[PDB]
PDB file of all heavy atoms in Angstrom:
ATOM      1  N   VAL A   1     -21.060   3.924  -8.293  1.00 46.43           N
ATOM      2  CA  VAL A   1     -20.715   5.325  -8.072  1.00 46.43           C
ATOM      3  C   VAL A   1     -21.715   6.001  -7.131  1.00 46.43           C
ATOM      4  O   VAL A   1     -22.903   5.675  -7.131  1.00 46.43           O
ATOM      5  CB  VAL A   1     -20.670   6.092  -9.420  1.00 46.43           C
ATOM      6  CG1 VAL A   1     -20.625   7.600  -9.223  1.00 46.43           C
ATOM      7  CG2 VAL A   1     -19.480   5.659 -10.239  1.00 46.43           C
ATOM      8  N   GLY A   2     -21.222   6.959  -6.351  1.00 42.99           N
ATOM      9  CA  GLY A   2     -22.056   7.643  -5.380  1.00 42.99           C
ATOM     10  C   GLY A   2     -22.254   6.865  -4.095  1.00 42.99           C
ATOM     11  O   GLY A   2     -23.065   7.251  -3.252  1.00 42.99           O
ATOM     12  N   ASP A   3     -21.511   5.780  -3.927  1.00 44.08           N
ATOM     13  CA  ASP A   3     -21.604   4.987  -2.711  1.00 44.08           C
ATOM     14  C   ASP A   3     -20.260   4.900  -2.021  1.00 44.08           C
ATOM     15  O   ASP A   3     -19.222   5.173  -2.620  1.00 44.08           O
ATOM     16  CB  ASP A   3     -22.130   3.577  -2.989  1.00 44.08           C
ATOM     17  CG  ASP A   3     -23.643   3.518  -3.019  1.00 44.08           C
ATOM     18  OD1 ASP A   3     -24.257   3.403  -1.938  1.00 44.08           O
ATOM     19  OD2 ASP A   3     -24.231   3.572  -4.119  1.00 44.08           O
ATOM     20  N   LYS A   4     -20.292   4.526  -0.760  1.00 46.86           N
ATOM     21  CA  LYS A   4     -19.091   4.377   0.034  1.00 46.86           C
ATOM     22  C   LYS A   4     -19.172   3.084   0.820  1.00 46.86           C
ATOM     23  O   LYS A   4     -20.259   2.664   1.220  1.00 46.86           O
ATOM     24  CB  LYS A   4     -18.935   5.575   0.973  1.00 46.86           C
ATOM     25  CG  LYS A   4     -20.138   5.808   1.874  1.00 46.86           C
ATOM     26  CD  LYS A   4     -20.683   7.222   1.725  1.00 46.86           C
ATOM     27  CE  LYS A   4     -19.679   8.267   2.194  1.00 46.86           C
ATOM     28  NZ  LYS A   4     -20.145   9.653   1.917  1.00 46.86           N
ATOM     29  N   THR A   5     -18.042   2.438   1.027  1.00 42.15           N
ATOM     30  CA  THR A   5     -18.020   1.182   1.739  1.00 42.15           C
ATOM     31  C   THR A   5     -16.778   1.107   2.606  1.00 42.15           C
ATOM     32  O   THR A   5     -15.714   1.611   2.241  1.00 42.15           O
ATOM     33  CB  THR A   5     -18.078  -0.028   0.775  1.00 42.15           C
ATOM     34  OG1 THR A   5     -18.180  -1.256   1.514  1.00 42.15           O
ATOM     35  CG2 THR A   5     -16.852  -0.079  -0.126  1.00 42.15           C
ATOM     36  N   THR A   6     -16.929   0.516   3.766  1.00 41.85           N
ATOM     37  CA  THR A   6     -15.819   0.311   4.660  1.00 41.85           C
ATOM     38  C   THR A   6     -15.483  -1.166   4.695  1.00 41.85           C
ATOM     39  O   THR A   6     -16.388  -2.000   4.725  1.00 41.85           O
ATOM     40  CB  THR A   6     -16.171   0.787   6.073  1.00 41.85           C
ATOM     41  OG1 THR A   6     -16.895   2.024   6.004  1.00 41.85           O
ATOM     42  CG2 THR A   6     -14.912   0.977   6.896  1.00 41.85           C
ATOM     43  N   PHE A   7     -14.206  -1.504   4.687  1.00 43.95           N
ATOM     44  CA  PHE A   7     -13.817  -2.904   4.707  1.00 43.95           C
ATOM     45  C   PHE A   7     -12.394  -3.078   5.217  1.00 43.95           C
ATOM     46  O   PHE A   7     -11.592  -2.142   5.206  1.00 43.95           O
ATOM     47  CB  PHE A   7     -13.996  -3.559   3.322  1.00 43.95           C
ATOM     48  CG  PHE A   7     -13.316  -2.860   2.174  1.00 43.95           C
ATOM     49  CD1 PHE A   7     -12.089  -3.300   1.707  1.00 43.95           C
ATOM     50  CD2 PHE A   7     -13.917  -1.783   1.539  1.00 43.95           C
ATOM     51  CE1 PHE A   7     -11.480  -2.681   0.635  1.00 43.95           C
ATOM     52  CE2 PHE A   7     -13.306  -1.161   0.471  1.00 43.95           C
ATOM     53  CZ  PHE A   7     -12.086  -1.613   0.018  1.00 43.95           C
ATOM     54  N   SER A   8     -12.105  -4.283   5.679  1.00 46.43           N
ATOM     55  CA  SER A   8     -10.794  -4.605   6.218  1.00 46.43           C
ATOM     56  C   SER A   8     -10.017  -5.442   5.211  1.00 46.43           C
ATOM     57  O   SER A   8     -10.610  -6.087   4.345  1.00 46.43           O
ATOM     58  CB  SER A   8     -10.927  -5.346   7.552  1.00 46.43           C
ATOM     59  OG  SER A   8      -9.660  -5.551   8.154  1.00 46.43           O
ATOM     60  N   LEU A   9      -8.701  -5.459   5.354  1.00 45.45           N
ATOM     61  CA  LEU A   9      -7.836  -6.077   4.360  1.00 45.45           C
ATOM     62  C   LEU A   9      -6.475  -6.375   4.947  1.00 45.45           C
ATOM     63  O   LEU A   9      -6.026  -5.700   5.879  1.00 45.45           O
ATOM     64  CB  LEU A   9      -7.712  -5.224   3.097  1.00 45.45           C
ATOM     65  CG  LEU A   9      -8.848  -5.411   2.087  1.00 45.45           C
ATOM     66  CD1 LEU A   9      -8.695  -4.465   0.921  1.00 45.45           C
ATOM     67  CD2 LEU A   9      -8.893  -6.846   1.589  1.00 45.45           C
ATOM     68  N   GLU A  10      -5.832  -7.399   4.416  1.00 46.14           N
ATOM     69  CA  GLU A  10      -4.472  -7.723   4.800  1.00 46.14           C
ATOM     70  C   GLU A  10      -3.528  -6.652   4.269  1.00 46.14           C
ATOM     71  O   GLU A  10      -3.836  -6.011   3.271  1.00 46.14           O
ATOM     72  CB  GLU A  10      -4.078  -9.098   4.254  1.00 46.14           C
ATOM     73  CG  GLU A  10      -5.005 -10.215   4.700  1.00 46.14           C
ATOM     74  CD  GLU A  10      -4.561 -11.575   4.209  1.00 46.14           C
ATOM     75  OE1 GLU A  10      -4.519 -11.790   2.980  1.00 46.14           O
ATOM     76  OE2 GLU A  10      -4.270 -12.446   5.052  1.00 46.14           O
ATOM     77  N   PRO A  11      -2.382  -6.438   4.934  1.00 47.38           N
ATOM     78  CA  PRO A  11      -1.414  -5.394   4.574  1.00 47.38           C
ATOM     79  C   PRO A  11      -1.168  -5.270   3.067  1.00 47.38           C
ATOM     80  O   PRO A  11      -1.233  -4.172   2.507  1.00 47.38           O
ATOM     81  CB  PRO A  11      -0.128  -5.830   5.287  1.00 47.38           C
ATOM     82  CG  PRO A  11      -0.449  -7.096   6.022  1.00 47.38           C
ATOM     83  CD  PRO A  11      -1.941  -7.182   6.113  1.00 47.38           C
ATOM     84  N   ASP A  12      -0.898  -6.404   2.425  1.00 51.69           N
ATOM     85  CA  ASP A  12      -0.641  -6.464   0.982  1.00 51.69           C
ATOM     86  C   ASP A  12      -1.801  -5.882   0.174  1.00 51.69           C
ATOM     87  O   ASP A  12      -1.603  -5.307  -0.897  1.00 51.69           O
ATOM     88  CB  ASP A  12      -0.420  -7.918   0.544  1.00 51.69           C
ATOM     89  CG  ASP A  12       0.887  -8.512   1.036  1.00 51.69           C
ATOM     90  OD1 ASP A  12       1.240  -8.304   2.214  1.00 51.69           O
ATOM     91  OD2 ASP A  12       1.556  -9.216   0.247  1.00 51.69           O
ATOM     92  N   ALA A  13      -3.004  -6.015   0.705  1.00 52.94           N
ATOM     93  CA  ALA A  13      -4.211  -5.595   0.013  1.00 52.94           C
ATOM     94  C   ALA A  13      -4.660  -4.221   0.492  1.00 52.94           C
ATOM     95  O   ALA A  13      -5.784  -3.801   0.241  1.00 52.94           O
ATOM     96  CB  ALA A  13      -5.313  -6.620   0.219  1.00 52.94           C
ATOM     97  N   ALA A  14      -3.759  -3.509   1.149  1.00 53.13           N
ATOM     98  CA  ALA A  14      -4.087  -2.246   1.788  1.00 53.13           C
ATOM     99  C   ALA A  14      -3.049  -1.215   1.402  1.00 53.13           C
ATOM    100  O   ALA A  14      -3.226  -0.462   0.446  1.00 53.13           O
ATOM    101  CB  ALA A  14      -4.154  -2.403   3.300  1.00 53.13           C
ATOM    102  N   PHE A  15      -1.953  -1.209   2.135  1.00 52.83           N
ATOM    103  CA  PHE A  15      -0.841  -0.336   1.831  1.00 52.83           C
ATOM    104  C   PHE A  15       0.185  -1.066   0.980  1.00 52.83           C
ATOM    105  O   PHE A  15       1.193  -0.494   0.556  1.00 52.83           O
ATOM    106  CB  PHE A  15      -0.214   0.169   3.120  1.00 52.83           C
ATOM    107  CG  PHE A  15      -1.019   1.245   3.792  1.00 52.83           C
ATOM    108  CD1 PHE A  15      -1.109   1.317   5.174  1.00 52.83           C
ATOM    109  CD2 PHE A  15      -1.663   2.210   3.034  1.00 52.83           C
ATOM    110  CE1 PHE A  15      -1.829   2.327   5.781  1.00 52.83           C
ATOM    111  CE2 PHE A  15      -2.376   3.222   3.634  1.00 52.83           C
ATOM    112  CZ  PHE A  15      -2.459   3.281   5.007  1.00 52.83           C
ATOM    113  N   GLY A  16      -0.080  -2.342   0.749  1.00 55.35           N
ATOM    114  CA  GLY A  16       0.761  -3.134  -0.109  1.00 55.35           C
ATOM    115  C   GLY A  16       1.934  -3.723   0.633  1.00 55.35           C
ATOM    116  O   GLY A  16       1.988  -3.690   1.864  1.00 55.35           O
ATOM    117  N   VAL A  17       2.849  -4.298  -0.111  1.00 55.15           N
ATOM    118  CA  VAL A  17       4.089  -4.792   0.445  1.00 55.15           C
ATOM    119  C   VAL A  17       5.113  -3.666   0.472  1.00 55.15           C
ATOM    120  O   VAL A  17       5.189  -2.882  -0.477  1.00 55.15           O
ATOM    121  CB  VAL A  17       4.635  -5.959  -0.401  1.00 55.15           C
ATOM    122  CG1 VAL A  17       5.812  -6.630   0.282  1.00 55.15           C
ATOM    123  CG2 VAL A  17       3.541  -6.967  -0.691  1.00 55.15           C
ATOM    124  N   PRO A  18       5.890  -3.538   1.563  1.00 56.96           N
ATOM    125  CA  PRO A  18       6.991  -2.577   1.629  1.00 56.96           C
ATOM    126  C   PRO A  18       7.923  -2.758   0.433  1.00 56.96           C
ATOM    127  O   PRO A  18       8.162  -3.884  -0.010  1.00 56.96           O
ATOM    128  CB  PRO A  18       7.697  -2.909   2.952  1.00 56.96           C
ATOM    129  CG  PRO A  18       7.147  -4.229   3.381  1.00 56.96           C
ATOM    130  CD  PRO A  18       5.761  -4.305   2.810  1.00 56.96           C
ATOM    131  N   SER A  19       8.445  -1.664  -0.095  1.00 57.27           N
ATOM    132  CA  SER A  19       9.078  -1.698  -1.396  1.00 57.27           C
ATOM    133  C   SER A  19      10.534  -1.256  -1.334  1.00 57.27           C
ATOM    134  O   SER A  19      10.828  -0.067  -1.256  1.00 57.27           O
ATOM    135  CB  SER A  19       8.291  -0.812  -2.359  1.00 57.27           C
ATOM    136  OG  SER A  19       6.957  -1.267  -2.493  1.00 57.27           O
ATOM    137  N   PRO A  20      11.465  -2.217  -1.377  1.00 56.52           N
ATOM    138  CA  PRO A  20      12.897  -1.927  -1.434  1.00 56.52           C
ATOM    139  C   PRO A  20      13.298  -1.277  -2.755  1.00 56.52           C
ATOM    140  O   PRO A  20      14.400  -0.759  -2.898  1.00 56.52           O
ATOM    141  CB  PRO A  20      13.559  -3.294  -1.285  1.00 56.52           C
ATOM    142  CG  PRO A  20      12.524  -4.276  -1.709  1.00 56.52           C
ATOM    143  CD  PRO A  20      11.196  -3.668  -1.359  1.00 56.52           C
ATOM    144  N   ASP A  21      12.406  -1.340  -3.732  1.00 58.16           N
ATOM    145  CA  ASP A  21      12.677  -0.780  -5.051  1.00 58.16           C
ATOM    146  C   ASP A  21      12.856   0.737  -4.995  1.00 58.16           C
ATOM    147  O   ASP A  21      13.448   1.328  -5.895  1.00 58.16           O
ATOM    148  CB  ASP A  21      11.551  -1.135  -6.020  1.00 58.16           C
ATOM    149  CG  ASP A  21      11.897  -0.799  -7.456  1.00 58.16           C
ATOM    150  OD1 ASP A  21      12.733  -1.513  -8.051  1.00 58.16           O
ATOM    151  OD2 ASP A  21      11.342   0.180  -7.997  1.00 58.16           O
ATOM    152  N   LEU A  22      12.367   1.368  -3.932  1.00 59.23           N
ATOM    153  CA  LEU A  22      12.488   2.820  -3.805  1.00 59.23           C
ATOM    154  C   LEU A  22      13.786   3.192  -3.121  1.00 59.23           C
ATOM    155  O   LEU A  22      14.063   4.372  -2.924  1.00 59.23           O
ATOM    156  CB  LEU A  22      11.345   3.445  -2.999  1.00 59.23           C
ATOM    157  CG  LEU A  22       9.949   3.389  -3.602  1.00 59.23           C
ATOM    158  CD1 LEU A  22       9.950   3.988  -4.995  1.00 59.23           C
ATOM    159  CD2 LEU A  22       9.431   1.973  -3.595  1.00 59.23           C
ATOM    160  N   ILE A  23      14.570   2.198  -2.737  1.00 58.67           N
ATOM    161  CA  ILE A  23      15.813   2.450  -2.041  1.00 58.67           C
ATOM    162  C   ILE A  23      16.807   3.179  -2.931  1.00 58.67           C
ATOM    163  O   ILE A  23      17.087   2.776  -4.064  1.00 58.67           O
ATOM    164  CB  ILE A  23      16.417   1.134  -1.512  1.00 58.67           C
ATOM    165  CG1 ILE A  23      15.474   0.540  -0.462  1.00 58.67           C
ATOM    166  CG2 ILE A  23      17.817   1.353  -0.942  1.00 58.67           C
ATOM    167  CD1 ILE A  23      16.043  -0.637   0.285  1.00 58.67           C
ATOM    168  N   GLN A  24      17.323   4.264  -2.388  1.00 61.99           N
ATOM    169  CA  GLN A  24      18.197   5.173  -3.105  1.00 61.99           C
ATOM    170  C   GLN A  24      19.364   5.540  -2.205  1.00 61.99           C
ATOM    171  O   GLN A  24      19.172   5.754  -1.009  1.00 61.99           O
ATOM    172  CB  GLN A  24      17.419   6.429  -3.506  1.00 61.99           C
ATOM    173  CG  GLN A  24      16.188   6.129  -4.348  1.00 61.99           C
ATOM    174  CD  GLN A  24      15.194   7.276  -4.382  1.00 61.99           C
ATOM    175  OE1 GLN A  24      15.568   8.447  -4.311  1.00 61.99           O
ATOM    176  NE2 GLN A  24      13.913   6.942  -4.470  1.00 61.99           N
ATOM    177  N   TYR A  25      20.566   5.602  -2.745  1.00 62.31           N
ATOM    178  CA  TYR A  25      21.712   5.930  -1.916  1.00 62.31           C
ATOM    179  C   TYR A  25      22.191   7.340  -2.215  1.00 62.31           C
ATOM    180  O   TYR A  25      22.725   7.612  -3.291  1.00 62.31           O
ATOM    181  CB  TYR A  25      22.851   4.938  -2.161  1.00 62.31           C
ATOM    182  CG  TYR A  25      22.532   3.507  -1.777  1.00 62.31           C
ATOM    183  CD1 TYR A  25      21.784   2.687  -2.614  1.00 62.31           C
ATOM    184  CD2 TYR A  25      22.991   2.974  -0.582  1.00 62.31           C
ATOM    185  CE1 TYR A  25      21.502   1.378  -2.267  1.00 62.31           C
ATOM    186  CE2 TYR A  25      22.713   1.668  -0.229  1.00 62.31           C
ATOM    187  CZ  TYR A  25      21.969   0.874  -1.073  1.00 62.31           C
ATOM    188  OH  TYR A  25      21.689  -0.431  -0.719  1.00 62.31           O
ATOM    189  N   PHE A  26      21.989   8.233  -1.262  1.00 62.62           N
ATOM    190  CA  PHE A  26      22.537   9.579  -1.341  1.00 62.62           C
ATOM    191  C   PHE A  26      23.729   9.730  -0.407  1.00 62.62           C
ATOM    192  O   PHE A  26      23.985   8.866   0.426  1.00 62.62           O
ATOM    193  CB  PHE A  26      21.453  10.599  -0.990  1.00 62.62           C
ATOM    194  CG  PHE A  26      20.365  10.707  -2.025  1.00 62.62           C
ATOM    195  CD1 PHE A  26      19.388   9.728  -2.139  1.00 62.62           C
ATOM    196  CD2 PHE A  26      20.322  11.792  -2.886  1.00 62.62           C
ATOM    197  CE1 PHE A  26      18.392   9.832  -3.090  1.00 62.62           C
ATOM    198  CE2 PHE A  26      19.327  11.900  -3.839  1.00 62.62           C
ATOM    199  CZ  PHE A  26      18.361  10.918  -3.940  1.00 62.62           C
TER     200      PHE A  26
END
């Protein structure tokens, strides 16, 4: 706590995998 770190990551480990589960039909 009280620290900050910068690091790189693969998509899945960052914004995650794109999610079709949120697909909604209006």
Side-chain angles (χ1 to χ4, degrees):
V1 167
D3 275 276
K4 56 235 295 174
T5 185
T6 319
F7 54 98
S8 186
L9 276 176
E10 303 183 297
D12 290 43
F15 284 143
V17 189
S19 300
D21 190 73
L22 294 306
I23 296 189
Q24 303 162 32
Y25 296 80
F26 291 75

